[PDB]
């Protein structure tokens, strides 16, 4: 490093004095770097004891010993034996005093902390391992750990650092349950880290699943917190890394991946279904690669999966799970209600002589029985007398799963018998204030069991009513988040007052979940279940998104009252305070919907502004297409904003053609280029294009039409010189949108122009090579429509070369047969199919032969209605290298019976092909 | 500190002797005036030094001097040690005037004064008996000596070989303290 440094100082630091000090309190370390590299040179020379100890620092003498708090904490001299200055420049942990224990949060890293990476690595790590090794008996001292949370480029360049951090956390949970430290750092890590590495995130998922499985968490019944975090780990990874990662954890489910978190397993298989549809991972084949998912099934089948009664089972491309759907034990022959009410009556009548025996007679904890006490109680003001409360809070969740399983059937039966709840308004208010007083349900498992067997067609309406009003009628929490809109949404990335803010928030409305909100004779607080209190609200709003998935994907028969759930999501704007990734949430719920979206179309007629405002819970002024539609939708929003879309789409594609080479530092990349899921602006282009084209129903069919229009009906805004950027842009927007959107391209290429006249007397334009291939339209001349069409084709072919191409072989066998008449049609379809066959050869070899015989079939046609073949030898050698370079001696037998019908010239050409 | 100047003239007289002269006298010029055996950044603060080379006027068609060492970063001087030229009197006075004008320019614009010292090296006993017909100087070697020592307080010095030239007698006009009495059989002194 010394020779390059010397050459640079001779070239870059072309000076001999150090004028213009330029203190620059805000940011100056980008300027004083010469003094830092010189000090590093002096330190290296002193370590080597030669080279005159890197003499003559006079060049920057003023900056040489300029070191003689928050403005100039230039921790540059931290090379060796000077760590005191950087370790004192940043406020360390407090040791004097001891739920506020660590005051004085520091400033956000972007101010000056952007540089301290080579120094602050294990300082906090050593601190936490030291405090965890000995003991943690006093209140947990480390609370400024939020500083360690926001280490973006630091954790980016040191992923092995956090890996070692976790492998050292493993001895911590080995010591004693990692009671305090884990429940302090894991939650904030999950709720603060978003753009984590996908393989690293699935490693984290495996780690958390292993730790939640073993050992038991009877005393740490709040363990479900990490389960909530698990949901955040199964959200943003479905885009691409699912396939490369499937083999990474290939051996884990062979023994353990679905031990007890069966609800979490159903959630993750739902997320996997979301991922597989983007983009069409199973539409190509459904017979041999089925085992690729059977393994997944092979796990959950051991723990009673897919208890769906085929209600929500409507998105799987491979419905092989229908082979195992009868073991769902639905309603237990409908007698489950009678059994549980009989046992509840037995318990209620035996409490007179069993309260001293129920302690020794708690075998299996009676999983679906204790929750039935809510109806028998509250007639004498909560007669529980904490008899079973302590018996409950040892297996609470593990028993409450069955509790809510039977309670769903109970409530649906009761509400179907009453048909209005005039008398059951009692239990209605019981469930309403059940969240007002602290209950152990935490509303974390209700919709899954409710969709298991209660959401059936005979009882879907009562469960929809439940989802609607079980949470909306109680006004203890909706008002709190209603005033919580102007706290984290406007100021989200200014983390400097988070401590006091969250303290005030979670001490004003809530107190603690273990605190028995039920008012029995006694209420011992036991204020020991306070390891860390970072957030109490993110859990419900994080879980609310699969709630939306379930309420929309399966219950779309109800148009009118959907305005009520619109008002509900208006009351739940906090749902969209973490991430805007509705791409999958629109795909998996829109797969077979675009063709039959009429009810959902009228729903979106009012949901447009609703989703707009739900996304508007920010102020970066980044999303303009939505605001552009808004300003274009002043009146009669059902018809107008969809008419001038083409020019509009221009602006749309305009933005995209400015995302790669244009005004790169624009309004799009910001806040904070690394937490809004910004590896590239096209990632943000994805969902905005999605929400734009999901407005009406005539798009999707009209997407490709309007694109081809703006191609040939080139608007004066569309330039003709940098067209290839627009080609890439259309390719991306097509490979991004769901199947009923790009499906039009088939007929756009083969049906519109491939037989415009193009049979015998097309024109003197018949010369195929110079014009049919693209890049011929380099001049304003030589621009044929077929050429631009082939260009758009090749674009969408290369972009969608994942699963969209998988339906292409059959396509050629279905529609391309009775359209091929002439030979330049054959050259055109070759231009269309050929240059992408190696993509199939990479993974989809099993269809190559098809393509092959497809081409061979074309030969037959160009053999029948054909007098002479002028450029036949191109096709001959093309097919020759097709056979020898890609297929080889593979399809000989199938082609033997087809090439025997060729013309004498073709026989004379391919008599070695037949060999 | 780190201030020196070299003036080589004994090309034809100390062609082979120059290697031993460097091995015995040129080493402390870097060992003492720097940290030790020399790639470093080059500045204009004054830590740099100069080195002038002059040839015989007789064995020269038209060229006189080829001085090149403004800064040298204290290592480029070590680079062109062996990059000298070779060519009976020598008439070195025309080359001493070059170092005179060089240190004049130094004192004129390179004044930040580190009292840069200068050393001459010759093997032939030179004398430019014609002190006339020059370009920008019309003085003899004794006049140049008393101007560079008496008028200018620059420390002058001449490191003669084992033999006895006339400059050992010309030293008596060195008014400033030169410390040229004891010979540098031990490590060379900063003031010879």
From Swiss-Prot, chain A:
Its main location: nucleus. One of its GO terms (biological process) is positive regulation of transcription initiation by RNA polymerase II. It comes from the Eukaryota. Keywords: Activator, Nucleus, Transcription, Transcription regulation. Signal peptide: none annotated. The keyword Cell cycle does not apply. It is found in: Nucleus. Component of the Mediator complex, a coactivator involved in the regulated transcription of nearly all RNA polymerase II-dependent genes. Mediator functions as a bridge to convey information from gene-specific regulatory proteins to the basal RNA polymerase II transcription machinery. Mediator is recruited to promoters by direct interactions with regulatory proteins and serves as a scaffold for the assembly of a functional pre-initiation complex with RNA polymerase II and the general transcription factors. Component of the Mediator complex, which is composed of MED1, MED4, MED6, MED7, MED8, MED9, MED10, MED11, MED12, MED13, MED13L, MED14, MED15, MED16, MED17, MED18, MED19, MED20, MED21, MED22, MED23, MED24, MED25, MED26, MED27, MED29, MED30, MED31, CCNC, CDK8 and CDC2L6/CDK11. The MED12, MED13, CCNC and CDK8 subunits form a distinct module termed the CDK8 module. Mediator containing the CDK8 module is less active than Mediator lacking this module in supporting transcriptional activation. Belongs to the Mediator complex subunit 23 family. This is Mediator of RNA polymerase II transcription subunit 23. The gene is Med23. The chain holds residues 392 to 1334 of 1367 of the full protein.
UniProtKB/Swiss-Prot annotation, chain B:
Residues 1-192 are annotated as: Interaction with the Mediator complex. It comes from the Eukaryota. GO terms for cellular component: core mediator complex; nucleoplasm; nucleus; transcription regulator complex. Coiled coil: none annotated. Keywords: Activator, Methylation, Nucleus, Transcription, Transcription regulation. Belongs to the Mediator complex subunit 25 family. Component of the Mediator complex, which is composed of MED1, MED4, MED6, MED7, MED8, MED9, MED10, MED11, MED12, MED13, MED13L, MED14, MED15, MED16, MED17, MED18, MED19, MED20, MED21, MED22, MED23, MED24, MED25, MED26, MED27, MED29, MED30, MED31, CCNC, CDK8 and CDC2L6/CDK11. The MED12, MED13, CCNC and CDK8 subunits form a distinct module termed the CDK8 module. Mediator containing the CDK8 module is less active than Mediator lacking this module in supporting transcriptional activation. Component of the Mediator complex, a coactivator involved in the regulated transcription of nearly all RNA polymerase II-dependent genes. Mediator functions as a bridge to convey information from gene-specific regulatory proteins to the basal RNA polymerase II transcription machinery. Mediator is recruited to promoters by direct interactions with regulatory proteins and serves as a scaffold for the assembly of a functional preinitiation complex with RNA polymerase II and the general transcription factors. Required for RARA/RXRA-mediated transcription. This is Mediator of RNA polymerase II transcription subunit 25. It comes from Mus musculus. The lineage of its organism: Eukaryota, Metazoa, Chordata, Craniata, Vertebrata. The chain holds residues 15 to 216 of 745 of the full protein.
């Amino acid at each position: 490093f010394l020779p390059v440094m010397k050459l640079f100082d001779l070239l870059y630091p072309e000076k001999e004095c150090i004028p213009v000090p330029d203190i620059n309190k805000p940011q100056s370390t980008h300027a004083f770097a010469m003094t830092c590299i010189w000090i590093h040179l002096n330190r290296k020379a002193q370590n080597g004891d030669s080279t005159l100890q890197i003499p003559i620092p006079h060049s920057l003498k003023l900056h040489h010993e300029f070191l003689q708090i928050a403005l100039l904490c230039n921790a540059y001299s931290t090379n060796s034996e000077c760590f005191t200055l950087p370790m004192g420049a940043l406020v360390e942990t407090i040791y004097g005093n001891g739920a506020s224990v660590t005051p004085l949060p520091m400033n956000l890293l972007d101010s000056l902390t952007v540089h301290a990476k080579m120094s602050l690595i294990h300082s906090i790590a050593t601190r936490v391992i030291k405090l965890a090794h000995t003991k943690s008996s006093v209140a947990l001292a480390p609370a400024l750990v939020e500083t360690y949370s926001r280490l973006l480029v630091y954790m980016e360049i040191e992923s092995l650092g956090i890996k070692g951090f976790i492998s050292q956390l493993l001895p911590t949970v080995f010591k004693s349950h990692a009671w305090g430290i884990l429940h302090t750092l894991l939650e904030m890590f999950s709720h603060r880290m978003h753009h984590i590495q996908p393989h690293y995130r699935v490693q984290l998922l495996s780690h958390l699943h292993t730790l939640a499985a073993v050992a038991q968490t009877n005393q740490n019944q709040l363990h479900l917190c990490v389960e909530s975090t698990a949901l955040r780990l199964i959200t943003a990874l479905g885009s691409s890394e699912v396939q490369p990662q499937f083999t990474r954890f290939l051996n884990d489910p062979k023994t353990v991946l679905s031990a007890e978190s069966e609800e979490l397993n159903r959630a993750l298989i739902l997320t996997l279904a979301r991922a597989t549809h983007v983009t069409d991972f199973f539409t190509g084949s459904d017979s041999i690669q089925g085992t690729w998912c059977k393994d997944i099934l092979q796990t959950i089948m051991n723990f009673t999966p897919h208890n769906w009664a085929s209600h929500t089972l409507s998105c799987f491309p491979a419905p092989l799970q229908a082979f195992f759907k009868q073991n769902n034990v639905p309603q237990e022959s409908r007698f489950n209600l009678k059994k549980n009410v009989e046992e509840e009556y037995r318990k209620w009548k035996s409490m007179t002589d069993e309260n001293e025996i129920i302690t020794q007679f708690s075998v299996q904890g009676f999983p679906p029985l204790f929750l039935c006490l809510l109806w028998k109680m509250l007639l004498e003001t909560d007669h529980i007398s904490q008899i079973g409360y302590k018996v409950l809070e040892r297996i609470g969740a593990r028993a409450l799963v069955a509790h809510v399983r039977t309670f769903a059937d109970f409530l649906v039966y009761e509400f179907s018998t009453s048909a209005g709840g005039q008398q059951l308004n009692k239990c209605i208010e019981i469930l309403n204030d059940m969240v007002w007083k602290y209950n152990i349900v935490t509303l974390d498992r209700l919709i899954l069991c409710l969709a298991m067997r209660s959401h059936e067609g005979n009882e879907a309406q009562v469960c929809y009513f439940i989802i609607q009003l079980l949470l909306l009628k109680p006004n203890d929490f909706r008002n709190r988040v209603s005033d919580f809109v102007k706290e984290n949404s406007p100021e989200h990335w200014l983390q400097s007052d988070w401590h006091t803010k969250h303290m005030s928030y979670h001490k004003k409305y809530p107190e603690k979940l273990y605190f028995e909100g039920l008012a029995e004779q006694v209420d011992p607080p036991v204020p020991i279940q306070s390891p860390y209190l970072p957030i109490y609200f993110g859990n419900v709003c994080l879980r609310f998104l699969p709630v939306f998935d379930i309420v929309i994907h399966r219950f779309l028969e109800l148009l009118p009252v959907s305005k009520s759930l619109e008002t509900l999501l208006d009351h739940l704007g906090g749902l969209y305070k973490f991430h805007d990734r509705p791409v999958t949430y629109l795909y998996n719920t829109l797969h077979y919907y675009e063709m039959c979206l009429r009810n959902r179309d009228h729903l979106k007629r009012k949901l447009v502004h609703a989703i707009i405002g739900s996304l508007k819970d920010n102020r970066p002024q980044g999303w303009c297409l939505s605001d552009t539609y808004l300003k274009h939708a002043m009146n009669a929003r059902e018809d107008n904003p969809w008419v001038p879309e083409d020019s509009y789409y221009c602006k749309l594609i305009g933005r995209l053609v400015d995302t790669m080479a244009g005004k790169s530092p624009g309004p799009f990349p910001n806040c904070d280029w690394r937490f809004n899921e910004f590896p590239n602006p096209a990632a943000h282009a994805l969902h905005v294009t999605c929400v734009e084209l999901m407005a009406l129903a005539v798009p999707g069919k009209d997407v490709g039409n309007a694109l081809l229009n703006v191609v040939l009906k080139s608007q004066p805004l569309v330039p003709r010189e940098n067209i290839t950027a627009w080609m890439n842009a259309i390719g991306l927007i097509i490979t991004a949108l769901p199947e009923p959107y790009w499906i039009v391209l088939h007929d756009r290429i083969v049906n519109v122009i491939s037989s415009s006249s193009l049979t015998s007397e097309t024109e003197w334009v018949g010369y195929p090579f110079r014009l049919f291939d693209f890049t011929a339209c380099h001049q304003s001349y030589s621009e044929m429509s077929c050429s631009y069409t082939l260009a758009l084709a090749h674009a969408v072919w290369h972009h969608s070369s994942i699963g969209q191409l998988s339906l292409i072989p059959k396509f050629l066998t279905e529609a391309l047969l009775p359209v091929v008449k002439t030979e330049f049609q054959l050259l055109y379809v070759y231009h269309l199919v050929g240059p992408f066959l190696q993509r199939f050869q990479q993974e989809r070899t099993r269809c190559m032969i098809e393509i092959g015989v497809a081409f061979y079939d074309m030969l037959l046609n160009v053999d029948q209605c054909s007098t002479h073949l002028n450029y036949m030898d191109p096709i001959c050698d093309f097919l020759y290298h097709m056979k020898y370079m890609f297929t080889g001696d593979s399809v000989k037998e199938q082609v033997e019976k087809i090439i025997c019908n060729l013309k004498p010239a073709l026989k004379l050409r391919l008599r070695f092909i037949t060999h | 500190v780190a201030d020196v100047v070299f003036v080589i003239e004994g090309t034809a007289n100390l062609g082979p002797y120059f290697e031993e002269l460097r091995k015995h006298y040129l080493l402390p010029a870097i060992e003492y005036f720097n940290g030790g055996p020399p790639d470093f950044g080059g500045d204009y603060g004054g830590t740099q030094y100069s080195l002038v080379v002059f040839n015989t006027v007789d064995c020269a068609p038209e060229s006189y001097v080829q001085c090149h060492a403004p800064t040298s970063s204290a290592y480029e001087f070590v680079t062109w040690l062996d990059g000298i030229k070779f060519m009976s009197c020598s008439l070195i006075a025309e080359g001493l005037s070059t170092a005179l004008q060089l240190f004049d320019d130094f004192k004129k614009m390179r004044e930040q004064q580190t009292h840069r010292v200068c050393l001459l090296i010759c093997n032939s006993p030179p004398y430019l008996l014609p002190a006339v017909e020059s370009t920008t100087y019309s003085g003899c070697t004794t006049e140049s000596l008393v101007q560079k020592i008496g008028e200018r307080g620059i420390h002058f010095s001449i490191v003669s070989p084992r033999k006895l030239p006339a400059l050992r007698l010309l030293f008596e006009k060195a008014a400033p303290p030169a410390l040229l009495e004891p010979l540098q059989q031990p490590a060379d002194v900063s003031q010879d």
